[PDB]
Design a protein around this ligand. Structure first.
Ligand SMILES: CC(C)CS(=O)(=O)N1CCC[C@H](NC(=O)Nc2cnc3[nH]ccc3n2)C1
Length: 277
């Protein structure tokens, strides 16, 4: 349906948790005979005013998004947000687990699919604010989708960026410098993060050459990272990374947001790369 009744939603396990929310594996089972379809259900664990307003906005945002490369809204229950369920789980773990099967073509196919999802999102004036391979889902061997719009913001019609009051709670290594220094988030800070997803993809999310493992190697942690970045230090090309892919990462990592490519510019290049590979 679009409206699911709580009494029919049957708990199975936890898929994730963060902020003050959780996503659960449930079966929607109105017959009560275990033949119902599976769904992923988000709820809040905080009955406070601004977190509920946030959760409500999240629901409206995901409701109004329609992409093959964005996780599907199914409905709500009255409080809870119901979505399609992707058993394969997150791309980060998938990459670590299937490393030896997936060649550069596939890595490029995923890159392209994510870019496309983000181009669309940006066309809806939506900043995701937490793009990272741990937040991307595997629909199938050759199909991924973006997930967790828990921190996503809509840009007002008159402003192409958004300032946030409180500090971030996400791993610092995916943040654009202007986010680090000023809490400024834009579609162009999404592009920065996307560059770190490309890195993640072409390292297959290996922990030993992770963004974190690499910063700590390159020597308050947040301040230090900002300095590194301002001096022009950048993550080095993943092992056996095609150079053209590394170059795209470096463009995504341009100091100033206005000098980063758009998602609509990036996509054609990834497709050309995919086809040539
Ligand atoms: C709770 C939030 C902070 C994190 S989160 O959104 O729960 N999250 C993101 C994707 C990876 C994990 N998800 C996951 O393993 N499997 C899975 C399957 N189908 C789904 N449909 C909708 C979400 C979702 N997640 C945790």
């Amino acid at each position: 349906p679009t409206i699911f009744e709580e009494r029919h939603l049957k708990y199975i396990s936890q898929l994730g948790k963060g902020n003050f929310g959780s996503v659960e594996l449930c079966r929607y089972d109105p017959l009560g005979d275990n033949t119902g379809a599976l769904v992923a259900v988000k709820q809040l664990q905080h009955s406070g005013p601004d977190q509920q307003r946030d959760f409500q906005r999240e629901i409206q945002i995901l409701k109004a998004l329609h992409s093959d490369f964005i996780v599907k809204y199914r409905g709500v229950s009255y409080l809870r947000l119901v979505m399609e369920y992707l058993p394969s789980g997150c791309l980060r773990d998938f990459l670590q687990r299937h490393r030896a099967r997936l060649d550069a073509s596939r890595l490029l196919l995923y890159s392209s699919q994510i870019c496309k999802g983000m181009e669309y999102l940006g066309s809806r004036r939506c900043v995701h604010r937490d793009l990272a391979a741990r937040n991307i889902l595997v629909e199938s061997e050759a199909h991924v989708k973006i997930a967790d719009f828990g921190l996503a913001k809509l840009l007002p019609l008159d402003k192409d960026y958004y300032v946030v009051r409180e500090p971030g709670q996400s791993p610092i290594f995916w943040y654009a410098p202007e986010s680090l220094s000023d809490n400024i988030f834009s579609r162009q800070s999404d592009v920065w993060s996307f560059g770190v997803v490309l890195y993640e993809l072409f390292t297959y999310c290996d922990k030993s050459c992770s963004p974190s493992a690499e910063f700590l190697r390159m020597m308050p942690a947040l301040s230090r990272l900002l300095e590194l970045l301002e001096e022009g230090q950048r993550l080095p090309a993943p092992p056996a990374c095609p150079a053209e892919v590394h170059e795209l990462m470096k463009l995504c990592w341009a100091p100033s947001p206005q000098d980063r490519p758009s998602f609509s510019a990036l996509g054609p290049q990834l497709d050309m790369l995919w086809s040539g590979s």
